[PDB]
Design a protein around this ligand. Sequence first.
Ligand code: ANP
Ligand code: ANP
Ligand code: MG
Ligand code: MG
Ligand code: ZN
Lengths: 434, 197, 607, 171, 192
Amino acid sequence: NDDDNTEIIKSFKNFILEFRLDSQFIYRDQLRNNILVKNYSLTVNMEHLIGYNEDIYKKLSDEPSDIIPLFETAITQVAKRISILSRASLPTFQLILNSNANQIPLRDLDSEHVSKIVRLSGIIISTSVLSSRATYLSIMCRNCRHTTSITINNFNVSLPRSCLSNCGPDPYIIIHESSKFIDQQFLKLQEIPELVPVGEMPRNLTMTCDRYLTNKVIPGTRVTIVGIYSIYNSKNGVAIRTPYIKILGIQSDVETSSIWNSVTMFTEEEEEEFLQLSRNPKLYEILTNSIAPSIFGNEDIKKAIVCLLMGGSKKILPDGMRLRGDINVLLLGDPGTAKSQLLKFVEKVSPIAVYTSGKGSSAAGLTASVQRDPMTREFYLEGGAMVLADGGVVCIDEFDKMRDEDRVAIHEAMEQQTISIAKAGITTVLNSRT
Amino acid sequence: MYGDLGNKLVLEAKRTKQLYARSNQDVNLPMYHEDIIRNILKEVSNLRKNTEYLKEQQQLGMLDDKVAKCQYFVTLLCMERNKRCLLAYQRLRTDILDSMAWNNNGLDTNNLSHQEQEYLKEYCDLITDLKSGDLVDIDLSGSLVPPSDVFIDVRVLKDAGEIQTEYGVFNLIKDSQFFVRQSDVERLIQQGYLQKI
Amino acid sequence: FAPDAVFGDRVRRFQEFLDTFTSYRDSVRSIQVYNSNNAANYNILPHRIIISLDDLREFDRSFWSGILVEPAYFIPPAEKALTDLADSMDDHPWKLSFKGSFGAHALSPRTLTAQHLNKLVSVEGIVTKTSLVRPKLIRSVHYAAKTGRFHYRDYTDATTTLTTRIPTPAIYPTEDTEGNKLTTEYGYSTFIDHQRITVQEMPEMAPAGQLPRSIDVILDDDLVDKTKPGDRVNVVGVFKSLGAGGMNQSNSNTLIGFKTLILGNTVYPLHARAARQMLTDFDIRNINKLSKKKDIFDILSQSLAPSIYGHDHIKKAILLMLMGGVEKNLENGSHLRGDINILMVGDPSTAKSQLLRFVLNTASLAIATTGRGSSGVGLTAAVTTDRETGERRLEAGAMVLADRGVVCIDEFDKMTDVDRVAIHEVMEQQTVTIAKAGIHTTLNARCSVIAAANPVFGQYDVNRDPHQNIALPDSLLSRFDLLFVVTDDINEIRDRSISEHVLRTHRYLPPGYLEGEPVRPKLVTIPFLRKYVQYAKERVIPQLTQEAINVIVKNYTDLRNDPITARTLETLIRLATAHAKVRLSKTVNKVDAKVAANLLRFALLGE
Amino acid sequence: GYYDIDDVLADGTEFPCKFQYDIPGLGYLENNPGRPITKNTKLNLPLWLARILAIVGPVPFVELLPPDMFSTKVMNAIKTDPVALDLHSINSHFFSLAIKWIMLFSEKELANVVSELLLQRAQELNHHASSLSITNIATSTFLLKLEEMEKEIYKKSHESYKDTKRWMFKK
Amino acid sequence: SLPAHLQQTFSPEEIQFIVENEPIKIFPRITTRQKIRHTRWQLITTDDKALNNMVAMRSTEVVLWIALLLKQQSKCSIVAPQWLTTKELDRKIQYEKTHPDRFSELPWNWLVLARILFNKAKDDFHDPIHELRGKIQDLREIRQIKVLKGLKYLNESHLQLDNLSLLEINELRPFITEIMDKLREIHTASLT
Ligand SMILES: Nc1ncnc2c1ncn2[C@@H]1O[C@H](COP(=O)(O)OP(=O)(O)NP(=O)(O)O)[C@@H](O)[C@H]1O
Ligand SMILES: Nc1ncnc2c1ncn2[C@@H]1O[C@H](COP(=O)(O)OP(=O)(O)NP(=O)(O)O)[C@@H](O)[C@H]1O
Ligand SMILES: [Mg+2]
Ligand SMILES: [Mg+2]
Ligand SMILES: [Zn+2]
């Protein structure tokens, strides 16, 4: 078996070391450039893997859960060969996959896709904390102190049942000092709204990412995913098991504020395009034309909507006082004056936004709500529309039909940019920059 | 305080430096800050009036060997600082104008001061004086990318009709393409009529 | 490479370090002689040293980076060497603590990451969900009744040790090897106090639209109870994993991770923008120097909220409320409160919320609340099950967390009345009483409430009476010391003044930022003002005096014999006592009573 | 350079000064031309002025107090972790100002520490300058913590690498 | 008058121009040597004789820009220098792996000439060109590791870089000189 695994590993080593287009060894260069900035991963385009040697892609797509670890191993060996002098240490490199295969919509994924590489898209509705998973367990026997170690690959693992040569019935314990761990995050992906069938409730999948794919995306972002559609045996029918996606690649339509507040991401070409756009003399008129272009007239409202999107400048003073930077606009008036259509456009164009209707809202449902975590039996705080809109806009349509004590709950978050909760023994002032 | 307007002006200098340094083309340099400069020059005139007042009052003699020495030294240093800020701003915009001269005019005018406009004229006159004198066999205003290819394909990007060259013609038909000696068309690549390589 | 072979060299290098930086030897001996004196004199300092980590770097960078990056192999030899130093002093294991310059190891519960496991880290955050304190068994001793020997047994778990020693099942011996019956000897057996706290990320730091992360800290022996919930803290300790992480095959779940902790080595309380500020003799002398300026009360109150125009009488009342009068205890334990309770009710955009936010940033201990966002239970205290043990336990609410501090309440009239029914005991008795879940207790809530509200109508209606303008019951309004009514009443001169002030306020630029770059007549500074308030709260308890009483009774009778009630009198006494604290004076005097009456006259009459 | 704009800006930063004499008329430094400056007045002055008043006097007219950017706190932060440190938040021109301060008061300790800082940050800076696209968040964060001095060195270095890569792979 | 990016270094194109002035061995596919039994090259930067006396497949040495100008047409084939072969590049790789401190004595123009000839003379190599590209890549990667190790020892005093290429030097120049300059400025500032 390990002879064949060695041949697979050598085949991938050759793919990294030999693949070349227009005089550039793109994977050698990418691996080196990643090593210098100390991200130990490689992004592979499966078009290139198919083009190199379609037998390799056949092995990978037949059984990715066995072949992806071997590819990662190959990447480690090349990483050492191109960044450490041979005969004068690095972790196991994550493999990230880019693909243009035909997507399966989230609702169509089923038993025929188990253990296959799958491509899909949706909106991330939740992101859990960074749990820790072992890559390498240092192990020893509780009685005779036989010491060994278990390398782990996270594609579906256990300790051994009895000692590897009396030691008692269940003999092994972990040694955490010499064991190694990685970040693991859970995301919940909900299917695209315009792809939901007629009269159906929108379906969602739990899915996991690890190493450098953690914290890459945040709730509300629309994403496309490459991953192994796979199963886990929950503690809860008969012979029934929970589906999930082991993520191998994430590609958001755009990246915004995922784990960054002062950091940014812009290319030189788009920065220069924005710079020469900023210098245009008719810029305000062009932006006003861009707002809701199929809505006639309402020019001062469109001008105000540009101002609301842009916002002012937030300020913090030696007093300690904070001055509100964002802008609030109310459209009050007659029926069919395109107010709701304008709110729809603003929710569509803003980089961060939420749309709610006042009669569909709640005080908690808007600012933030207390929840009880069921198996912990303990209270925690979950964000409402103001939290999800933080750093952007909340479009409160149908505002006059909001119940008054729901309406009053907006006051602090609307002026002080904060939500002062005091409930169930929780006391916090969450930020809401909306 | 007397240094502040100089700091505002050289922060302006730094921002226009970054504006010019971010791109391959000559970015059109921003407006000449006449208002901040006039505020500085008026501030310098006030500092001069203070030196005049003090050098008058050294006839009246108040503690002058130290106190008048100190007041004079401080106001003198304020004037040195304001001179440095003014000259830093003007030297940067001079440098950018010299660059633009060699790049184009030696082969947006509202943004210059009149001294800068006539300076740019005189500097172009100087560049032309060099390439018109001795060393004339080299077009000193030419490019500084080495000649990699003697024959090039060039696609006609804008129409200009029939023009002669040293031993022939080009009819610059829109979206026609030539295969031609680079030295016979370089002027038109610089002038933006021809596209490739 | 095996750790034991290098333990001796590491020990002698830390011994050479301690010998070199002899301030640590002096500290060890100071602790020892203090404890010896207090043991004999019939309260005890712990066997713990804070080493400046900079000193250890400048001594030996290799050992320093060993403490940072491999503490499980470098702290035990350092603590052994320290214990040997303490042993070398004339006539128990000594522990270490660390301060300074952690660099990349300075983190928060968000950016603490699996790459940091088993390293020494410093985390900044806010404490929540402190467990009960429990004794943790570490050694048990047993008298073998027939054999006569004292047998013993050590114990281990993943929290007791920096390295993963084999576990011990917490079972007490009962029989000798020969089968002789054992008896456990408490008092010779050894237990450490153990406490588990959740440090939460500071909400100001959490990125856009994400909620605060949190991590669990373990504290042992003298570190226990060094913090309560709501404390902003910096914790230093070893970030660790523990448990099986589902690798034990009884757990079918493939995806769950390992539990992780910080094993704490020191705990620093914070209010940097320290919870208690240190005062140099220079600070003492400056504080006294300023107190003799004839109009110091005006200087300090003008120095409050310098970005708020006007509202002079409110800022004066706020200053006296930060410096509340002395609490009285009388016969049969009868009690008179010393807090000053303020209600700002008035028109919108009259800086009521901004004044609350200034107070929140200026008091030593302030808890923010808002009317809709506050439950009555979330305000007093809430019953929860402590998952560490399974017992019903109280979680302190805002009024209890602000004890010996202040509470800020914005949008106060927007509260539901079953919330305001829970306000009454705090105002009237400085306490809250619980009678539910089989828990029957009373908790201290001794704090100045300052609150902001609007009238029942959107703006104050001068055609109608205060009880008709103001939503709250008279049974609640009478409990506030000062009821302020403010209005945004239009006037060109005042509008010009406030406008040009607000434009100066909005034209501010903090240091070092470029023009237009986004952010990441004598008056005292806010740090100075915070120090002055701490000084006056700690070091002066003004005594009432007859010359002040004469002014007080004259003014009280005059105010009453023209809304006034019996409670107005001790409010005047409190305001006078607090103004005596502003003067740093051991006595209340006629000046204090005059200012107190002037300010309460403003509040009542709109003078 | 006299016209070196980043030097003109660096000279505009301010340092804590303690005056050594009672001098009439200089109160405009204290925002009132009609009053004296007094001995042991502690005041922040721009370095283009503070540099001179600390040498002319005899006792010089000004003593320069130790600025916070070279305090023991900052030096210890430097000496633990040079690459993680946010020098830009300490002072945007910290290296130019350190060079001026070392020259103004010959100080071997600070010269060594600033040399160590520069070298250890130059390694990381070269790593981010050498890595090229085929911006990375790990690079995008590090460039915030660079001084204007280091940002200039980074742009020049990274442009050199990018130009070389361009020439090698594009015909 | 000189662009900002050319102030204190060479562009990669200028490095190519410098390397293009080297002589190179070619097989002519034209005959210019006239028999005893018409235009001559008449150059002024380089020697005119070899071009005036070419005979087809009698190998001869000419300046590289002329060799490329001929190889742009079918009229020439450029003989690879001896170092640019699989066995020789493998020997240099083994030297690089064997001696961590030294750079192997590849000629100063090696990367530039490899780029030029792989693009303009892809059909003239005896070895399969994909292997030569692979081994040139191995060499640049290993030498870059050595460069990174070297930069840990920058000084206020001096540095030694025995066999580093012209292109590798030119790539590093606006970094090494700047950092050593600022270390000098820090050091000299401390002197009394
Ligand atoms: N100026 C306009 N230009 C184009 N379509 C318009 C315009 N005004 C109204 N409409 C159309 O009429 C409808 C407007 O609905 P809507 O956006 O709900 O208006 P509204 O102001 O929100 N009225 P209401 O929700 O009853 O208060 C849409 O179908 C629009 O296409
Ligand atoms: N006197 C003042 N000086 C400066 N700013 C002021 C003043 N009065 C109000 N403001 C500004 O008004 C804004 C709103 O202040 P805020 O404290 O929220 O008012 P408020 O009294 O709480 N109104 P409300 O919550 O609707 O009852 C802030 O940005 C203040 O800076
Ligand atoms: Mg509508
Ligand atoms: Mg308010
Ligand atoms: Zn065993």
